[PDB]
Subunit: 410 residues, 3 copies
Amino acid sequence: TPVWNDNAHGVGSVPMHTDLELDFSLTSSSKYTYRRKLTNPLEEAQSIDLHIEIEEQTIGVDVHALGHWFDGRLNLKTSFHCYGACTKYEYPWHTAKCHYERDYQYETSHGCNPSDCPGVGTGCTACGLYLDQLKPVGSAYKIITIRYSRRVCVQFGEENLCKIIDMNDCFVSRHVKVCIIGTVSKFSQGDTLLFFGPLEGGGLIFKHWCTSTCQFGDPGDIMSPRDKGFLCPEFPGSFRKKCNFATTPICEYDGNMVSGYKKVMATIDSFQSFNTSTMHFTDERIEWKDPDGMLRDHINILVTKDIDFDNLGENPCKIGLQTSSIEGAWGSGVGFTLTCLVSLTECPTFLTSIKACDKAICYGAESVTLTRGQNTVKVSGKGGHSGSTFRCCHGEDCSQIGLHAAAPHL
Amino acid sequence: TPVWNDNAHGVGSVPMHTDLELDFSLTSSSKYTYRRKLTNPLEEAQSIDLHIEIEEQTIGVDVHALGHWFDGRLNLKTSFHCYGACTKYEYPWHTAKCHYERDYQYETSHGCNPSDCPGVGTGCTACGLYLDQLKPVGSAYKIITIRYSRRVCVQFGEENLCKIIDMNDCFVSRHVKVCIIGTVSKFSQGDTLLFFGPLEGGGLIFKHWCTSTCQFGDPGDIMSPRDKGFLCPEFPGSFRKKCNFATTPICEYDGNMVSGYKKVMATIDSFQSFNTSTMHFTDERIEWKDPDGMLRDHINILVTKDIDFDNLGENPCKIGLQTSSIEGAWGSGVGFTLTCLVSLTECPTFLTSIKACDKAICYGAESVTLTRGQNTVKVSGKGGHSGSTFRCCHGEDCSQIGLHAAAPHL
Amino acid sequence: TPVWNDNAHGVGSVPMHTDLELDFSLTSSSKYTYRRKLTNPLEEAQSIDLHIEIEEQTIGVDVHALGHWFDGRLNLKTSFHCYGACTKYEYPWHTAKCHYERDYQYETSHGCNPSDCPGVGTGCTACGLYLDQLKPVGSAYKIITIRYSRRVCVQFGEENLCKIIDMNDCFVSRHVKVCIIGTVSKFSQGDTLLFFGPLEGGGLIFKHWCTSTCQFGDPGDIMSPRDKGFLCPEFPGSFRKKCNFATTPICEYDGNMVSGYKKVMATIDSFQSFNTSTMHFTDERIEWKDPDGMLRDHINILVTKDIDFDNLGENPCKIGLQTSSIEGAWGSGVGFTLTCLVSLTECPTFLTSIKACDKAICYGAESVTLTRGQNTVKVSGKGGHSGSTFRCCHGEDCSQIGLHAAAPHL
Ligand SMILES: *[C@@H]1O[C@H](CO[C@H]2O[C@@H](C)[C@@H](O)[C@@H](O)[C@@H]2O)[C@@H](O[C@@H]2O[C@H](CO)[C@@H](O)[C@H](O)[C@H]2NC(C)=O)[C@H](O)[C@H]1NC(C)=O
Ligand SMILES: *[C@@H]1O[C@H](CO[C@H]2O[C@@H](C)[C@@H](O)[C@@H](O)[C@@H]2O)[C@@H](O[C@@H]2O[C@H](CO)[C@@H](O)[C@H](O)[C@H]2NC(C)=O)[C@H](O)[C@H]1NC(C)=O
Ligand SMILES: *[C@@H]1O[C@H](CO[C@H]2O[C@@H](C)[C@@H](O)[C@@H](O)[C@@H]2O)[C@@H](O[C@@H]2O[C@H](CO)[C@@H](O)[C@H](O)[C@H]2NC(C)=O)[C@H](O)[C@H]1NC(C)=O
Ligand code: NA
């Protein structure tokens, strides 16, 4: 007969037994303070201090750091030999991290040879494209998850409690409820954020950063994921061997010659900037306060001075947690799955959520009806980094250890 | 003087004449149950059973099924003839559903002919690209419309009513109001959902699935919309005829050789997965429950035990409906328009909404001020399938027949 | 000790001292009217007229007008001369606004010359691509900012006040609060809106309109930003010179030949339409009412008849404003920054917002704690046009002049 459930975060109240309601639209980038002495209508001389502090909205973005985007110049060179396979000779572009070679092997002919080459169907004209004058222009981050929150502190008499409240969640206590409701549409999963400097200050949003095909000229075309090593772009144009009598062959390439950075800069007003304040970069995560004062969220504060609220998630159920296994990846839009062993006592069943968390950041949650005794719960999550130890959590309680997920893009 | 309006779904209340309020943030993937005996303060011995059941959030997506995405291999063949027009000969790739031929016609020459061909300016070198080793890898669906809802059942005494409540709509009865407020940003119109298996389980979101230009290597490059017949990708590279004395010409192609499926798999962590539970595929529609427990919505429940709420949409107006005509398409982001003949009586005017619906799914709505007598109302909608009969509807009332829209992509 | 803050738009109330609450979900495209006489419970004969009018939701989009998109035909011509540099001769495509020339200079040869040309390594074969049969097919607009609002008028007794209330903001007066809460996901920043006619009526949303690389065949490939002058697309295919003995060379081009307009039309159902009503185009801004009756927002109205609400933003602080400087651009996703000189009196500090506005449209806001005396406040904004004079504003108060930002895409 009982069907305990703690997935409802909020309260039951009787409107005539409720003393105060604050309801307002608050600038997202603003804090809010409320202080009041709750006095007894005047049948008493007993007063309760109420002190509420709401902090500015914070955004937390789980990301994959993509490394640096580069500007560069596309260069073309020709190397001709009258005799010998193309691989017999070393070419100047061989040291270039990003090069692309097209060979014309065993194709010498009378009207396309230098004066000293009498070869026909011999040797090699090698054409080499390579990037040079490389310079990093910014750091790029792929958005995996976006969350907004406000830190909320409530003092009611001598009770004082602070909590980070996610947007569209509620702060719940015996005498005070604080609910935050809102929506923001600035950032999307899969967007790529580009920071051109120590871009505290701000950055750019790219909605079409190249992924499965990067061609030279694309946003994101030339990337270095870590200090050394490039992900090189494709060069989709064609080579031609230009021929003349008594003349060395000359390679031509008819594709785009202008880097993605230059093409983006040339139409920079087509792209959306954002600003940041009090940035915090950690591995695969960025947190900041967006100073855009045009954005607002909705705050509702309900206070009952005498009778307690009915906490809609109240229950006698008791949970023990440990991690069992993990699969999947950090830094990945596909994500990981954490398997948890969860013990339920003091209730035949309990509808609740089990979360994958590390250091008070949560990366995933599974709603589940647990049965008395042991339960196996799989939690899907996204985000984290190589050093993350994802723990199985229930409310503020977590297991004693956590597990690492695998690296993405292997 | 009267200006009846039923577009407001909700209630007028007097806070001192209201007995109970539940206000909370609920895990989207969780149900919620509230049961209570409403007793008379103690001036009576009369109690009313209140029983509220809120079901897990469901997503309903109107889609266009795009068929299967394929992996495959790009092959190149050459066919040379010393004499004759290129069309005089049948080539091996002619049976390939996806092939592309480039001809060098009447271009034979001394330094590019096999030993037995003395032709000059004759015959044909035919170059043929074709896809083979084709294998379907997943089913793709273009998102047309996204809607979220929760089924809400309220028993108040012997009154019992269940309704599917859309997110950002309200359940309204004489004694109980249930409002659901929320926002989700996981899916967008125009996204393409890819299911790799019986992907109950989950799938991938693609934000850049090819549409007006599909090149080989793109996400979505090789599609079969129905069982037989391909939408073939473009091959944007160039052919070359490689020549040698006393040698048959050899075709070369310098474009990308790697399928879109392989390119996407090679950077799969760049893409966003989603999970599903209790999937229901119907023609051009998918419904499921998203098990992502990180998502929440806001629930407000208001109860008055004695005096009825003031139903803000209450009115004496009476409506008769029939379909008149339709234009436009199902399975289309452009959509259809249903024309309805709507008769108003018992009111000089009535501000309301007329909807296009089939089997309790609604695909479009028009807010309108009707005048006494006959009215012509055009309703824009999107979604449905070839078997849909779109009816003109008002509230829960619909016309006696419905109409079919036309097929998309003709 | 005081910490005045006017960034909270709303009220403090005591639920037992509140007389009326209206709470409902309203069709976005519908107006709403409430009229009532608030009578004194019956201890009096004094009645207060309450009259609330809520207008249909309006969308306001700050845009950059991109000019007209064109359909056209891609044509190819050859021009051969036996002798002379390619630049020595004028070619037919030279007058074409969008043309692309590939030259084969000093490459004549025996098996590729007309009968009257004995040249070897001389002259020129010039290949010219050009667009012709150009026709504008629609007007395109890049979305910079999206905002929704409703005009709200409240009469309470002889007090009458009308205000445009942004979605997720509140109307605040002594006796009536009106809060609007909602979310819409139809349009996104960076989307491109295409109107094919006087498209009052509607248009199409493009999520991938070309920007930093436009190739022929892309959505947005051929644009004319203003009356005269094209932004021409790239032609990424290859030229070939087809050769025969005693024959003039013939240029070939192997790239896509089909315009972006034709490719988009051929799969038009892949794209999302929207409808409009009562459109208003101004420079770099479009406003309309979306007639999509499937969309709803949430309205809460709270009334206290006797005791005033506690206005949570009430304060004694006084502000003087003037513009100081500006940098950045109108019509730009990167935006501008307006620097304001702001004088605070009657308070040691004041937490508030300073806005950049022109003619009652606001383009940006900065939340700031001002100190008594002079303050310098930088406000980031987006939108506007060449004729905008951005003023520094606080609430409904603005400075005496405003400043122009610079043009984008210089
Ligand atoms: C939630 O989804 C994950 C994701 O796995 C799926 O990814 C989709 C995008 C699609 O490609 C699909 O074919 C694929 O299965 C599920 O986890 C996976 O489960 C399979 C089957 O056991 C394993 O082989 C995978 O290694 C595993 N991956 C991860 C990262 O865990 C998961 O089962 C599903 N359901 C739940 C409850 O989480
Ligand atoms: C709502 O919009 C539809 C859509 O029609 C428009 O589609 C735009 C994307 C754009 O291309 C525009 O040029 C086009 O008109 C309107 O319906 C269309 O109306 C025209 C004019 O009568 C007809 O020729 C079309 O067949 C018709 N199409 C459909 C699907 O009905 C519609 O009029 C408009 N208004 C309302 C109230 O629905
Ligand atoms: C808010 O952001 C603007 C934007 O400027 C930045 O744009 C980013 C996309 C990125 O490219 C970054 O490197 C760049 O600085 C800031 O304004 C700019 O500030 C610099 C430094 O003084 C000036 O050189 C620019 O001209 C100026 N541009 C504009 C349009 O004002 C701004 O400082 C930042 N902070 C605030 C409080 O607005
Ligand atoms: Na080419």
